[PDB]
């Protein structure tokens, strides 16, 4: 019940080594109904970073089909989750490729997305984690056009562990505009997990602060938040799982971390990909509880 | 060249460094600042900078901010502040909108925009401590609690006067100490009044601005301040004129056209309130 006593149970599970045992018994993907036939199509192979990290057909984000993309396919999963009535709306996707930047902005528009959570640098260790899908400030190319959408980079403020970028997205056919807040975590190392737990907590707080800012203006549902990493599974799952459990701590509620993660993996395979990533969630929850 | 690295000083003196696009308007920065401040009622506020004459010119929220600081400012640093002072601070409903108002009203007292006597400056600092510091665990020499003015032994006398009215205000919430602090500054003279240098129809220098009642003209030579009934407001050349028909003159045509905007702005803000 106590915040300091909820912390001890988490610390005890970490100290006694239970988090390593309970992580290994969680299944990586769906036991049944795990078909990803739409993603496994030859025409869609060009649209996947990794051919082994795919969305399920019944939860994939489903673009309005066109003639270039006959299946309206994008490597993105819908993540809707509920605990004791508290509902959660996420969209998890891989880092956009060059040929899927149009598909990415098609999804951001069609799903009414207003906040993007990028948990990775564009490149890490010389490997591409996400293509540069929003224009760069400082250059003369401060505007890009993907399909029917013309994105402009409008400001950028840099905190030590994260960077907030404000984007304006214009539908050239209709003329409609939409402010899109781009939150990028920049403190995750190339190998391993972040050491600055308090800094990663601030990145999750900025997400909520932007979530509260955008929802005050929308009187009529609230759009899902787009988390993306290299494959949209491991660091993506860390953000989603952390933010879910922190709410269970906030609104006093029994914490069953493997039960939530097992539910998350029923909607996107391999959410929280490594043991390090899982113990990181335990350490982040502990550090949050030691707020005072 | 293609972007401006600007620094926005919040009312609590913190800094936020914004890399700004050339197209970005001042409204977009103010909305970005409101996000970080958790502020919801963004209508009462705006941003301002020191111009070439070190005069507080509020930014044009509808025009791009990058061009304004390049063309008309010393350094690329704007300041967060209240452009629309409300008559009733009871009108402010949201909690965080009140705290930022509290910071602006406190800064108006500590820096001397609103002149207060010795005793008023004493009673003000008492409610400030109960909200700035809180109900003491036991501390006042730390930060500034008084306006400009000082003699070392008058500082010791007043600080203990604040340190005794500190205990009388005990057990009350800091949000309520902020309210009672505002609703006293709320009722002072010069509260929410901004003066701009100008010359009169006789060439005598003066100070002109827009108060809640209407356009106030105070005179440097001590002449009784007139408070204008106004059919409309207009601006011509280096002059600025009201109609009933009176006209004042300013430094240059930039300065006068600037004042016409704020007057009609404050006139629009007050007629809605
Ligand atoms: Cl990943």
Residue numbers in the entry:
A (entry chain A): 878 to 1097, 1100 to 1171
B (entry chain B): 20 to 157, 163 to 173, 176 to 254, 258 to 273, 279 to 307
Sentences from the paper on this structure:
PTPN21 belongs to the four-point-one, ezrin, radixin, moesin (FERM) domain–containing protein tyrosine phosphatases (PTP) and plays important roles in cytoskeleton-associated cellular processes like cell adhesion, motility, and cargo transport. Because of the presence of a WPE loop instead of a WPD loop in the phosphatase domain, it is often considered to lack phosphatase activity. However, many of PTPN21’s biological functions require its catalytic activity. Combined with biochemical analysis, we have found that PTPN21 PTP is weakly active and is autoinhibited by association with its FERM domain.
To help crystallize the FERM-PTP complex, we generated a mini PTPN21, replacing the disordered region between the two domains with a flexible linker. After adjusting the linker length, we managed to crystalize the FERM-PTPC1108S complex and determined its structure at 3.0 Å. The mini PTPN21 structure showed that the FERM F1 lobe binds to the α3 and β5 regions of PTP and buries an area around 886 Å2. The interaction interface can be further divided into three parts. In the top part, highly conserved residues from FERM α1 region (R59, E57, R55, and Q54) interact with residues from PTP α3 (R1089, S1086, and E1083) through hydrogen bonds and electrostatic interactions. In the middle, FERM β2 forms an antiparallel β sheet with β5 from PTP, which is stabilized by main-chain hydrogen bonding and side-chain hydrophobic interactions. In the lower part, R1031 from PTP β5 is sandwiched between E42 and E47 from the FERM domain, and E42 also forms a hydrogen bond with N1019. Mutation of critical interface residues in either PTP (R1031A and R1089A) or FERM (E47A and E57A) abolished FERM-PTP association. Several mutations found in patients with cancer [E42K, R59Q, and R1089H, from The Cancer Genome Atlas (TCGA) and Catalogue Of Somatic Mutations In Cancer (COSMIC) databases] are located in the FERM-PTP interface. Normally, PTPN21 is in an auto-inhibited state, where the FERM domain interacts with the PTP domain and stabilizes the WPE loop in the open (inactive) conformation.
